[PDB]
Design a protein around this ligand. Structure first.
Ligand SMILES: [Zn+2]
Ligand SMILES: [Zn+2]
Lengths: 458, 88
């Protein structure tokens, strides 16, 4: 009379990181995302794939290119018994192409990606357009706008009438270049939604931008250099839009070579050309100015590109947008160990720092940090540490409003630490206490990893 | 001089643990697998060893697995309920 809908995560439940969720219903199996945990390396960074037969997965959908959602895909497609089909949006695949080599190196610590594996690790990935339903052996799915970063999507899946909405990571506040998350025209029986910020509240965009610009403006005037740890691309372009506009608003003070802006990454050149070729997939505010001046708004006048530090003359104040975002390795870590001994330098965290990473540890203002090249030699940390969120996650009120607009009878929380997730659950159960006991009673689940949630339907 | 074949259940290839003698304890085999694959201090996972044919678990760390045996390995979330005892 009733069949069982089955949910369980291989990672990213009651935590942020190594996102991977499995759905089973009427003999079909869907995998949502395939990330790693930035606090670990090698196999230790992987979802708990040993707990599920990956050969049973029919389709694998990737919400966006961030490392905690896609960095486990090369491993899944090369080292496991996975044989299903993989889907992502066009900008996600175009960006994923250049994150591929760095994703492999993180999971292959315990070899290196070659051009031969480029066929199986990349060409096999299929792309979907937004709002265009794909049907694969009875599993229908549709990509909707999610905000967050370019190419990010929410997926509504339909299996024999049952509809499930996966938000991935999403935002609803109007971005400076991204379309905000949308409500699918059709209802959903199950909502899988992120819980990153829990019940916390964030300030409006105009307040965070002014707080960001005035903070950096005060730091560089006193002779301090600013380091902004960012992911290779995504949110870094939003910060560059804020700074390149602000720098020209005050070009008499910081124009030309006066305190130059640097976008330091070994993907700087290619990450930009992807952004300049997907403008038509962005919000109307950015395409108007793309149509107004007829010049690409992502061609920054007050920002220069830097690929390594081999020929980087560092004297005088300068603002440094460097990758990786968690300061776990790479360039941003090298400049962190180089600029933190000075007390009036600023390390400004703009994204969500995952538990166990150096970006999270530096916000506790330690006296010293261990050097990356050898751990048992410490470096004094005197620099100023601040945090202004541009992570493009919904806060409590934005999340609750979207959840209420979906109005699913079953909510499954993912992608949040245990404490903020558990507080979000209580608020949702309290907000829906009126319907408790009636036919529209809302059930909320906050499962841990590898814990099955079983739902009965028609 | 002796070897035990192991494979993570989600992985395609098989690896080896080299040692000396007739066999290894379930404890030492788990310890070697953790260290060889840099799995961590054991607070983030559990490690369980299984028989590939009967699918029964080697649930006793004192059992000596004879040389040339093959086993299936599963790394699961931590619930002592973890793998720290195979690291300390
Ligand atoms: Zn994300
Ligand atoms: Zn995420």
């Amino acid at each position: 009379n009733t069949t069982t809908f089955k949910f369980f995560s291989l990672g990213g439940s009651n935590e942020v990181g190594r996102s991977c969720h499995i759905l089973q219903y009427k003999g079909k199996t869907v995998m949502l995302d395939a990330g790693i945990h930035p606090a670990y390396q090698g196999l230790a960074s992987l979802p708990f794939y040993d707990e599920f037969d990956l050969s049973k997965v029919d389709i694998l959908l990737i919400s966006h290119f961030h490392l905690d959602h896609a960095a486990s895909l090369p491993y899944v497609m090369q080292r496991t018994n996975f044989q299903g089909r993989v889907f992502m949006t066009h900008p996600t695949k175009a960006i994923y192409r250049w994150l591929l080599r760095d994703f492999v190196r993180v999971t292959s610590i315990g070899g290196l990606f070659s051009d031969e594996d480029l066929v199986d690790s990349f060409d096999k990935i299929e792309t979907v357009d937004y709002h265009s339903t794909v049907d694969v052996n009875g599993i229908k799915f549709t990509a909707f706008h999610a905000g967050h970063v370019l190419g990010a999507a929410m997926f509504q899946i339909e299996i024999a009438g049952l509809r499930v909405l996966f938000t991935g990571d999403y935002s609803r506040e109007v971005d400076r270049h991204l379309n905000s998350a949308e409500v699918p025209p059709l209802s959903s029986n199950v909502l899988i939604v992120e819980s990153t910020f829990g019940t916390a509240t964030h300030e409006p965009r105009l307040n965070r931008e002014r707080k960001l610009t005035q903070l950096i403006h005060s730091t560089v005037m006193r002779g301090g250099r600013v380091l902004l740890p960012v992911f290779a691309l995504g949110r870094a372009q939003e910060i560059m839009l804020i700074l390149d506009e602000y720098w020209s608003q005050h070009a008499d003070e910081l124009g030309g070579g006066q305190v130059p802006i640097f976008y330091a990454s070994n993907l700087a050149k290619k990450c930009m050309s992807v952004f300049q070729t997907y403008v038509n997939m962005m919000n109307d505010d950015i395409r108007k100015k793309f149509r107004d001046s007829q010049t690409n708004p992502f061609i920054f006048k007050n920002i220069s590109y830097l690929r390594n530090l081999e020929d980087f003359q560092d004297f005088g104040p300068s603002v440094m947008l460097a990758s990786p975002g968690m300061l776990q390795s790479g360039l941003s870590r090298d400049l962190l160990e180089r600029w933190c001994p000075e007390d009036k330098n600023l390390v400004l965290i703009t994204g969500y720092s995952i538990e166990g990473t150096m970006a999270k540890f530096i916000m506790l203002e330690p006296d010293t940090i261990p050097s990356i090249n050898n751990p048992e030699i410490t470096i004094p940390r005197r620099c100023q540490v601040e945090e202004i969120s541009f992570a493009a996650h919904v806060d409590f009120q934005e999340n609750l409003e979207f959840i209420e607009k979906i109005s699913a009878p079953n909510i499954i929380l993912v992608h949040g630490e245990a404490n903020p997730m558990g507080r979000l659950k209580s608020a949702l159960l309290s907000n829906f206490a009126s319907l408790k006991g009636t036919d529209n009673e809302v059930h909320v689940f906050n499962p841990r990893n590898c814990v099955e949630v079983d739902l009965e339907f028609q | 001089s002796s070897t035990i074949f192991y494979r993570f259940k989600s992985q395609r290839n098989t690896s080896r643990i080299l040692f000396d003698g007739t066999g290894l304890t379930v404890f030492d085999l788990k310890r070697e697998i953790i260290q060889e694959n840099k799995l961590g201090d054991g607070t983030d996972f559990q490690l369980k060893i299984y028989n590939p044919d009967t699918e029964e678990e080697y649930d006793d760390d004192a059992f000596v697995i004879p040389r040339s045996t093959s086993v299936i390995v599963k790394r699961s979330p931590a619930i002592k309920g973890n793998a720290t005892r195979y690291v300390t």
